[PDB]
Design a protein around this ligand. Sequence first.
Ligand SMILES: CCCCCCCCCC(=O)O
Length: 133
Amino acid sequence: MVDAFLGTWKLVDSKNFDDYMKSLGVGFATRQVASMTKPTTIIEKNGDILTLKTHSTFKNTEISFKLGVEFDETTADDRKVKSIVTLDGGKLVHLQKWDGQETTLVRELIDGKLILTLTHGTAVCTRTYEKEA
Ligand SMILES: CCCCCCCCCC(=O)O
């Protein structure tokens, strides 16, 4: 039951993204630009294959995956990670692993908004997306 996630979403609120980027080792100049960007996230499905696009004026990313199947991913900050996306309690949980480190990207629907929670180390960032029609 991934169907409620599908569509086009626009960032409307961000808390502590600088704290998350610093924890990942992102350089101050990239943090500047990223702090002022309002990405568009598009989530599409074709059968068992999900595609997640993140578009912005700064960086674009795209991944395609099947739920529960590991994949190789190159992140926006140029980390080469082993990724798995699963559905857990109605949340879309994206785990990235590299160099014995982990970060989670959890997406949940609350009151029709998409809440993305990013955790690395002690850093927790919350990003709120709203559906575009
Ligand atoms: C340039 C820093 C990149 C950090 C990793 C990707 C974070 C995604 C944020 C989002 O989709 O809203």
